[PDB]
Amino acid sequence: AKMAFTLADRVTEEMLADKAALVVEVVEENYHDAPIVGIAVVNEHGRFFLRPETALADPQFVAWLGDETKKKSMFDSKRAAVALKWKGIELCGVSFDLLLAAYLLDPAQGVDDVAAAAKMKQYEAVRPDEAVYGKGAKRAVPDEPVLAEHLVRKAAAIWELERPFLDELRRNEQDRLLVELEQPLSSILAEMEFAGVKVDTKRLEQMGKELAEQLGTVEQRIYELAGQEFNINSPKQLGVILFEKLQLPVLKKTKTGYSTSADVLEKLAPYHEIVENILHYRQLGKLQSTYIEGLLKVVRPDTKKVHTIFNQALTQTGRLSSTEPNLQNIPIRLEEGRKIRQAFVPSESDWLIFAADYSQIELRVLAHIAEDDNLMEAFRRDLDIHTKTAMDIFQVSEDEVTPNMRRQAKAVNFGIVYGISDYGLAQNLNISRKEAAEFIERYFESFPGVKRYMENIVQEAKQKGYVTTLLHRRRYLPDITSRNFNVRSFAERMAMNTPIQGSAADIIKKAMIDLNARLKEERLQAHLLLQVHDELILEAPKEEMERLCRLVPEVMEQAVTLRVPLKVDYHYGSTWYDAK
DNA sequence: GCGATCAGCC
DNA sequence: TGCTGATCGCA
Numbered sequence: 001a002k003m004a005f006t007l008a009d010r011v012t013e014e015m016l017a018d019k020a021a022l023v024v025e026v027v028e029e030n031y032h033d034a035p036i037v038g039i040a041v042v043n044e045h046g047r048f049f050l051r052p053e054t055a056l057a058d059p060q061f062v063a064w065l066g067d068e069t070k071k072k073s074m075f076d077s078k079r080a081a082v083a084l085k086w087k088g089i090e091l092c093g094v095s096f097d098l099l100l101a102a103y104l105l106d107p108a109q110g111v112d113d114v115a116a117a118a119k120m121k122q123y124e125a126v127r128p129d130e131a132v133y134g135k136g137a138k139r140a141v142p143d144e145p146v147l148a149e150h151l152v153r154k155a156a157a158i159w160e161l162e163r164p165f166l167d168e169l170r171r172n173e174q175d176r177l178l179v180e181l182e183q184p185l186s187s188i189l190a191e192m193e194f195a196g197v198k199v200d201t202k203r204l205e206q207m208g209k210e211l212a213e214q215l216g217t218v219e220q221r222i223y224e225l226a227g228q229e230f231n232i233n234s235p236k237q238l239g240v241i242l243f244e245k246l247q248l249p250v251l252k253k254t255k256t257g258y259s260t261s262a263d264v265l266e267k268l269a270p271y272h273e274i275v276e277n278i279l280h281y282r283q284l285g286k287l288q289s290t291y292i293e294g295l296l297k298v299v300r301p302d303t304k305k306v307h308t309i310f311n312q313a314l315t316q317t318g319r320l321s322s323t324e325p326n327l328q329n330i331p332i333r334l335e336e337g338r339k340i341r342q343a344f345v346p347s348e349s350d351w352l353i354f355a356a357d358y359s360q361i362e363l364r365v366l367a368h369i370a371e372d373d374n375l376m377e378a379f380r381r382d383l384d385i386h387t388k389t390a391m392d393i394f395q396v397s398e399d400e401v402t403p404n405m406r407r408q409a410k411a412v413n414f415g416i417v418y419g420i421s422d423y424g425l426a427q428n429l430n431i432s433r434k435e436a437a438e439f440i441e442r443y444f445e446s447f448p449g450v451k452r453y454m455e456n457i458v459q460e461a462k463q464k465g466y467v468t469t470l471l472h473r474r475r476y477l478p479d480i481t482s483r484n485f486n487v488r489s490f491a492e493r494m495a496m497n498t499p500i501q502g503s504a505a506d507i508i509k510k511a512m513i514d515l516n517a518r519l520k521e522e523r524l525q526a527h528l529l530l531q532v533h534d535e536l537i538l539e540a541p542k543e544e545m546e547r548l549c550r551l552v553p554e555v556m557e558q559a560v561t562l563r564v565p566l567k568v569d570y571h572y573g574s575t576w577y578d579a580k
Numbered sequence: 581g582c583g584a585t586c587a588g589c590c
Numbered sequence: 591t592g593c594t595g596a597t598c599g600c601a
């Protein structure tokens with residue numbers, strides 16, 4: 001059963017062919033400045049295992065790694081590329097990434113190792129990483145004999161699976177999606193992660209001290225209002241204090257007990273002064289724990305930078321996700337938490353942060369895909385879409401739109417993109433189902449094309465078994481035929497929402513690729529730092545701001561051509577906060 | 581370790 | 591709608 005391979009003590013020309021499956025193993029989940037525990041190469045000449053200290057010190061091997069004409073097939077090439085960047089070695093020529101290929105074929109499979117991808121094609125001559133390295137506290141690198149065979153088997157699977165995967169991608173019309181979008185983007189993300197974002201730790205440490213003070217006061221007041229001390233962070237102990245000791249009314253329960261969600265507490269605020277304080281405590285504690293302490297734990301002491309990892313093969317819609325830290329959910333709505341962004345600064349003096357965001361890209365994409373005359377005209381006039389929606393559903397002139405009307409029209413617009421549901425809208429606007437239903441019916445009378453799209457996309461999902469995005473990303477929806485109402489309904493909302501959210505993801509990804517190419521052409525020092533779904537954040541010399549003010553929006557607005565214009569807003573300043 | 585709870589943004 | 595991650599409780 002064992003697989004044959006050469007456990008080489010030195011590198012040979014034989015292992016430097018112009019096409020090969022390459023494995024540069026980094027076991028640590030977070031690959032930044034992490035160890036490369038072994039290398040495996042499989043090509044027309046055979047299978048090889050090389051110790052990293054050997055291969056990575058070899059002039060020939062390193063040159064081969066950096067030679068773009070020498071093609072390599074891999075799994076999660078970004079992980080290897082970044083781990084190599086930290087060692088001052090460039091990886092080029094990656095023409096096929098099995099992780100990205102598997103992700104495009106079916107993001108629902110949750111493929112996270114070679115074994116999982118291989119199983120898609122009935123190939124099982126490779127073990128899952130978890131079985132070899134174990135998990136959690138017991139996750140360790142095995143002895144060389146066990147390690148070497150694993151890396152060789154992974155490289156062998158990659159070598160064998162490339163053709164089958166590329167063939168199915170072609171049939172799905174996703175070959176260009178992999179080769180011209182996801183793979184090139186992978187290299188850009190590697191550069192962004194490696195560059196990192198400079199953090200002002202002193203500023204963070206100072207904010208944390210202020211929060212600590214406020215939490216102290218609010219915490220004491222809470223015990224004062226409750227007549228005793230208890231763990232506020234335990235819904236269990238809070239529930240007894242609120243719904244038992246204070247006799248507050250139970251407006252919602254949870255599988256385990258009483259509900260203490262912010263939405264429920266605000267409705268209880270009028271009854272007791274403790275509720276307001278609990279809410280405030282919830283706010284402060286969130287910033288302190290998740291952002292201040294959480295951010296300070298991942299900043300690198302030597303450079304004062306945070307190096308996030310963009311998971312490119314996780315979301316079911318095509319969006320990127322960010323971890324350690326998640327720089328895609330830094331506070332912005334509330335001012336107190338928004339100030340956390342003052343902590344993100346340029347990596348060099350005399351440099352500034354430049355941020356550009358698409359204005360209502362999802363609604364614009366919807367206007368385009370549904371070809372709704374009213375909605376397309378609205379964006380062609382660059383109207384305030386929420387005010388316009390309010391005018392139509394409530395049948396009033398612009399002057400007649402009140403702040404509450406706009407707020408509700410705004411909530412309807414969000415529902416429409418998420419896959420409208422009279423139940424979900426009702427809960428959100430704190431109104432009845434029938435009323436939420438009335439709003440929805442009114443919306444469809446105003447936007448018949450959108451109604452048509454919603455009906456047709458659900459039908460299509462049932463017919464083909466999946467829905468697609470502008471650049472041909474795909475999402476299978478087997479639950480679309482379920483006889484269970486809740487399960488089937490979720491699938492229907494997914495059918496309505498994916499072409500919208502997914503197409504928006506396709507566009508920003510293409511914009512990143514086009515932008516990176518333009519910056520190089522223009523010889524600008526400016527570079528991408530982060531992406532947050534509908535916005536791109538860069539940093540550059542202060543002398544490049546004027547050129548970026550024209551270049552970035554143009555590149556982003558021209559990424560794709562839709563039936564409606566794409567609009568990009570932009571700002572720049574000394575910190576991320578000031579890039580407003 | 582792992583669920584159920586909560587809350588941050590898109 | 592799509593995410594990450596915190597603290598708690600239990601195991």
Ligand SMILES: OC[C@H]1O[C@@](CO)(O[C@H]2O[C@H](CO)[C@@H](O)[C@H](O)[C@H]2O)[C@@H](O)[C@@H]1O
Nearest residue numbers: 029030076079112113309311312313323
């Ligand atoms: O290298 C990122 C890439 O690896 C996967 C597993 O194949 O995720 C691993 O690394 C992430 C970043 O450290 C972790 O969040 C995740 O828990 C770990 O399994 C892929 O999902 C990802 O695309």
Ligand SMILES: [Mg+2]
Nearest residue numbers: 357358359534
């Ligand atoms: Mg925006």
